[PDB]
């Protein structure tokens, strides 16, 4: 339901679902996204069983001390940890329909204020970043807003020097997180609305 930019034009239309971003739909997609990448790298040696320490220190009875039996246990300084973190997974399969629904609500929430559609190419001389900065300045991308960019030609991204600017993705790299993370979204107008099926 939104228009275009420089390389050409379009007057583009497509249906946008009502965003549940602040709702659990977008919030769920973001949480699944961050959790999916987790490294599970918590290995404490904590279990009494790998602390490297001995046998049976002294007398079960009649020494006048406290009772203990080995030196490898959570009550002992130096021993293991009860219930220490172990390496593990964190990843799970969020339902697919919620994936696509989230990403669509993402795009949508940006169309409600400030999304932009790069029309079948920008003019950037060679690959020089300075001309990207000129191009974006002439498309109203100040120096201010953090912005995300999606495209496919190598060169236009090869002005991908984030300077409080230019977080960069190709096609299919899109994700609810990376767009929701930025203010304006400079979506690549082409496959930006090549309708599925």
């Amino acid at each position: 339901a939104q228009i275009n930019v420089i390389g050409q034009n379009g007057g583009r239309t497509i249906e946008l679902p009502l965003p549940e971003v602040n709702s659990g739909v977008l919030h769920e997609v973001v949480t699944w996204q961050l959790a999916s990448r987790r490294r599970g790298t918590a290995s404490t040696r904590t279990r009494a069983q790998v602390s490297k320490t001995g046998r049976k220190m002294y007398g079960q009875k009649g020494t006048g001390n406290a009772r203990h039996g080995d030196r490898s246990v959570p009550t002992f300084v130096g021993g293991g940890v009860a219930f220490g973190p172990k390496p593990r997974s964190y990843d799970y399969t969020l339902p697919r329909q919620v994936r696509q629904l989230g990403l669509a609500m993402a795009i949508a929430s940006r169309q409600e204020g400030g999304k932009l559609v790069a029309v079948d190419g920008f003019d950037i001389a060679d690959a020089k970043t300075k001309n990207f900065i000129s191009w974006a300045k002439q498309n109203g991308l100040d120096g201010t807003e953090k912005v995300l960019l999606v495209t496919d030609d190598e060169n236009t991204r090869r002005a991908a020097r984030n300077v409080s600017w230019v977080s960069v993705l190709p096609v299919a790299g899109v994700n609810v997180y990376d767009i929701l993370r930025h203010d304006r979204l400079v979506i690549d107008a082409a496959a930006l609305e090549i309708v599925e099926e």
Binding site: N22, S23, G24, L26, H27, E28, L180
Partner: protein, 137 residues
Amino acid sequence: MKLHDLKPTPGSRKDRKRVGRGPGGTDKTAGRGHKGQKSRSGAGKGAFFEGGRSRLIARLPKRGFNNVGTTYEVVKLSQLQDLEDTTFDRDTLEAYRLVRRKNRPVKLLASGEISRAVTVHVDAASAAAIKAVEAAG
């Protein structure tokens, strides 16, 4: 949008029971009452006279058909219901079993459905609406 203004749907998330941790709730004993309730847990379907101890009458095998009530079959509006292996039915328990149509409701219309077997009266209600059914031969 506001990544700080993402809000989980109220409900959904609920906090874990942190057990030990104070006479502000669930103190010394951790919801366990002073008992022969102690770490290394042991049992779930057992007392000692057992009483799931009644006697048994035993067959080993079984085999059964995929079910196709004709009621959905008849309101279909597209008649001559010979299923390609994929479509509509058997999604649960599809390719491992055989089909058998049965005399759940009716709507009356012509239709030639070719299930692997069928109830005697689905022939009654299918042939009565001028409708063949090809049991495999």
